[PDB]
Structure formats: C-alpha cells, structure tokens
Amino acid sequence: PSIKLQSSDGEIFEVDVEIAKQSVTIKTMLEDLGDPVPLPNVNAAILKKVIQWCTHHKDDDDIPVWDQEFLKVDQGTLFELILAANYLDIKGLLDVTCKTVANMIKGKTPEEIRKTFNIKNDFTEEEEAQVRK
C-alpha cells in the first residue's frame, strides 16, 4: 500500500502501490525484485505530472475535461509526456496525450502543421494531393 520511486535525476517519490499500478511496466515491478525502483528514462518534473495524472484516475472518444486542462502544458512537455506514458506503459495517459497532439493536427493544412511542429518542407518535386486515394 506504499512504494518508493526514483527518477533519472536522483529524486525519490512515494506513491501507493494502488495508483502506481496503472503503469504496467512498474506494476510488473512487484515481482522481479520487491531502495526505490529506478526510472532512468524519466526526469523528476515529468514523473511528478505522471503520478499526478494517476492519482486522479485511481479507480475508473471525447477526452475528459480535467485531462484537457492537465495537458495544457507547453509542446516540449507533451512530447515528454507521451514518452513517459509509453515508457511507464500507462495506456490511458498515452491515448489521451496522443489524442491531444492529433487534435493539434486535425483539419489543418500541411503548411499549418509544419509551422506548429517546426517540421521542414522536405519535398523536392511538386506536392500533388491525394483525395480518398
């Protein structure tokens, strides 16, 4: 009913084995060694927001209203969030965070999406559009 977590930058976090169970990769960390559990790929800032999301979804389309305000982060941290979610295997966080990025692309022009994501215009020949295929 209580477990210690260590981020990449030394910091220790204490959370209930209950909310720290949604993360399938560290839920599998009861067995196989049961003195925190080391997380080399997440920094402290992100691991915080990770447990925070998980303590809102302890029990438990359009994406819930809280998650929307919760993911009102800067772009860099969204990236950090889908990687943490993927790293930690929190299916709910990944779906919602990918959904959030998708919504950024939804209905936009190629030019507009290159701007919002700082992607370069790769193309060498004329950009011919496909409709339905």
Added chain:
Amino acid sequence: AVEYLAELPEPLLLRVLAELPATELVQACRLVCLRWKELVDGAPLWLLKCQQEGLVPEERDHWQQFYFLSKRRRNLLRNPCGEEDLEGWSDVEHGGDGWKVEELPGDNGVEFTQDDSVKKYFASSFEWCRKAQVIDLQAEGYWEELLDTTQPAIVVKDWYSGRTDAGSLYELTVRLLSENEDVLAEFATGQVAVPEDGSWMEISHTFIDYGPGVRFVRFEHGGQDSVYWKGWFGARVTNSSVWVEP
C-alpha cells in the same frame, strides 16, 4: 532549433496519426513532409487504424485500401424493400396492375426468415413488372485506381418468392458498365420459375477480375404471374443489395 513531436519514435507518431480521419491522413498529412508521406503510404499506420476500429478479420494487398473499403461497405441500392415507395427505382415498368408494395408475410406467402428487419416487399402483376438502379461507383466512394487496379469484389444479392396459390416468374439482370455506359460484364438469370411453395429464394453473384474501366453497376429485376390474374399474383422481390467488398 526545437523539434519535439517530429523526432517522435515511429510507433508513437503512428498512434498520433491513427487518431486522425483517413481522409485527412491521405490528403493533408501525406503532404506535410517526406517522413509522413512514407508513413501514410505504408502498411503499419493503416494496420493500426484497422485493429483500432475492430476491422481486423501479417500482410495485405493494401491496408489503406482495406480500411476505406471496410468503412465504406454498405448497400448501394436505394429503398430495397419498399419502405419508401417506388422511390429510388428507375426504368420502372408497371405491367398489368403494376408493382404494389406489400407487408410481410404476404397473402398466401411465407415469412422472411433470413433477416427480420425486412418488413415489406414489391409485388408484380400479370404482365412483366421491372425496375432498376444505376449505381455510380465513384460517387459512392470507389475511386478510379481502386476500380481499375484492385477491381474489388462487387457483390449482388436479391430475394424473390411467389404466392402458394399462383405460379409466377422472376428475372434479374446485373451489368457492370464503362464510363460511357458500355457493358463490360453481365450476370443474367434468364426467366426463373418461382418456387411452388412460396419459399423465399436468394440469388447471389460476385463480380471479380472484371478488367479495367468499370464505373457503374446497373441492377435490374422483374416479376410476373404465370396465371394471368388481375391483382398482384406475380413474383415478389425484396431485400436487394449491391456492395463492394473489402
């Protein structure tokens, strides 16, 4: 220079892209950059969208194609049972007293077993009664290159019966048509004697490997009695369908 979502690992960029409507994926996303073009033209994106939407029934002739065909799979005939009246049907020939829409089970006819959302049928009279639809394939969402190269299965189905108290006849003609409405394939039944005992019959045909150029499907069918009585003693038709199979 800051580039976050973009340097995203492929399986994760895939999850983001899978969230988007196939239509935008093909039209806008493909045009963003060369990495995205390659993903949109690839199998994994669409394989992902398929399993996500329950469509998966390893490899494919085209997973993107599978996806559009699967989502777009529906009966292309208007009003197949008579719920509207003769609406949606063209080249309607009213022989004798003409077509009449009636409720199941008929007077002296058997129940429609095979699907019980089907509640009505069209009844023919004492001269040939006919009706047709011409389906514009591109208008229904099947693009030229799919039609000319994949040539996906065009499945045609019909149901007919007669009264137990009167002999009747049935006819079906389905044509695949060029852009210019020249005939490229034809499935014809000839005149079929409806079962004696009023049991519903299904006629089915699948067109495959039909060559390039198919743009329209012409569905035509007809019925009449073989006893020449006033009223509606001829063949009964219902639950007609045409669709393209993924």
